[PDB]
Amino acid sequence: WDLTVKMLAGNEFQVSLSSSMSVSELKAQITQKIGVHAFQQRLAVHPSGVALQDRVPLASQGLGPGSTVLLVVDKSDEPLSILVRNNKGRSSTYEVRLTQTVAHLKQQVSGLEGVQDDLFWLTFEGKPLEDQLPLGEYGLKPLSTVFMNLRL
C-alpha cells in the first residue's frame, strides 16, 4: 500500500508495500530511500505511539493505506569485539562494526585461519549468516561466538 514515513529528524516520504506487506518489507523500503540499514531503524505507529511488531503483519497492527509511522535512525557504529570459533574449536577475537557485511568478516576470518573463504560459511545461534547482510542484522554483542562450518 501507500504508507507515509515521518521522521522526527527529517521530513517525510511515501513508501509502497507490494506483497505480504510485513515489517521487513517496510524497512527494506526505508533502506531503499535513505540507505540506512534495517537494524538501525526505530519505528513506531502514529499516532498510537507504540513500536512495531516484527512478527505481526502490518495489517493486523493498526497500519494500512494512508497510515503514518515514525522513524528515528541510529547513527552510532562503534567497534566491538566478537569471537569466531574455528573447525578445531579454537576461538579468536575480531574487532568489527555492526555495519560491515558477513562477506567482509569471512575475508578477515579466512585471512587469519588460512582457509579460503569459499570453503566455509558462518553461523550464529544455529542460523547461518548471509554474505550480503550486515553483522548488526544478527544481533551480535561483545564476545558473541560465531561458528565456522567447513563445506566438507
Which residues here bind Os ion, judged by CB under 5 A? Answer: 11
Which CB sits closer to Os ion, 11 or 76?
11
Q: Closer CB to Os ion, residue 11 or residue 60?
A: 11
The residue whose grid cell reads 527529517 is 10
Nearest distance in Å: CB 6, Os ion: 6
Tell me the closest approach of the beta carbon of residue 8 to Os ion, in angstroms.
7
Number of H helices, E strands in the chain: 2, 9
User: Least distance (Å) from Os ion to the CB of residue 43?
Assistant: 15
Nearer to Os ion, 11 or 132 (CB): 11
Gap between the Cα atoms of 134 and 39, Å rounded = 9
Q: How far are the Cα atoms of 19, 118, 119 from residue 150, in angstroms, in the given order?
A: 36, 9, 6
